[PDB]
Amino acid sequence: KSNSKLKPEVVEELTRKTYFTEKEVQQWYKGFIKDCPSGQLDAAGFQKIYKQFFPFGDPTKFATFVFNVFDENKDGRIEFSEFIQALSVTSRGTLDEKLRWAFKLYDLDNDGYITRNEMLDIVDAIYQMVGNTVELPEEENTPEKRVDRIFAMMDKNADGKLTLQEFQEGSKADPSIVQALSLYDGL
Ligand SMILES: O=C(Cc1c[nH]c2ccccc12)N/N=C/c1ccc([N+](=O)[O-])c(O)c1
Ligand SMILES: [Ca+2]
Ligand SMILES: [Ca+2]
Ligand SMILES: [Ca+2]
Ligand code: NA
Fold it and tell me: Is the minimum distance from the CB of 90 to ligand 1 under 6 angstroms?
């Protein structure tokens, strides 16, 4: 096995917690192990993954935000159970499940609201990750302008924070958000 096989009860458990079949779970564990022999992905390794996908801007900050959502137990490592569950929601979830995950990504302090400064932190990290290989349209060319449009559309009581309900409904109102979150294996 060389631990490239999971225990049977662990295969059954992870298949039951994800949109993957038993075979798919086993294939992902095999790749996870070749790429991370210790069975634990650290923040540095996560940033390397994002560094290859996005070699034009600095993805340090954004990969760290994502790393922290993958890291459901906050021990500073991604283990396979965490990895596979995060991949299942982000690649195969329903729109409501992806929106719940997205909310956890933006709710940096886990208090149930996304403030404007929280969203600005995430959106700045995204802008930095893409980097200015291309010029954006003027009305969305800073992270501030993007956050202001989002709060205009979604902050219904205009208190400077988004509840989970405001983010979900606000997200569903915008066709480009709906589109981005309704993919299954990217399609
Ligand atoms: O290791 C991975 C996944 C993954 C895909 N293909 C692989 C091959 C080898 C190892 C890992 C992978 N990080 N992406 C994570 C992720 C997190 C959040 C979002 N979001 O922000 O939407 C997303 O789209 C993907
Ligand atoms: Ca962990
Ligand atoms: Ca918060
Ligand atoms: Ca609000
Ligand atoms: Na499954």
Answer: yes
Q: What is the C-alpha separation between 187 and 180, in angstroms, rounded? A: 10
37 inside domain: yes
- Tokens encoding 136: 């954006």
Proximal ligand: closest to the CA of 125:
1
What total number of domains does the chain contain?
2
Place of tokens 């979604």: 154
Quote the strand ranges of 25-153, DSSP E: 40-41, 78-79, 113-115
Structure resolution, Å: 1.8
CA distance 36 to 38: 6
Residue 159: DSSP 8-state: S
Residue 183 CB less than 6 A away from ligand 1: no
Domain boundary among 76, 94, 112: 94
Label residue 93 left, alpha or beta by phi (over 0 means left) and psi (-120 to 50 means alpha): beta
The distance in angstroms from the start CA to the end CA of the chain is 34
Rounded to the nearest whole angstrom, what is the distance from the C-alpha of residue 76 to the centroid of ligand 2? 6
- Contact between 178 and 153 (Cβ < 8 Å): no
Residue count of the chain, please give it.
187
Give the tokens for residue 49: 């993954």
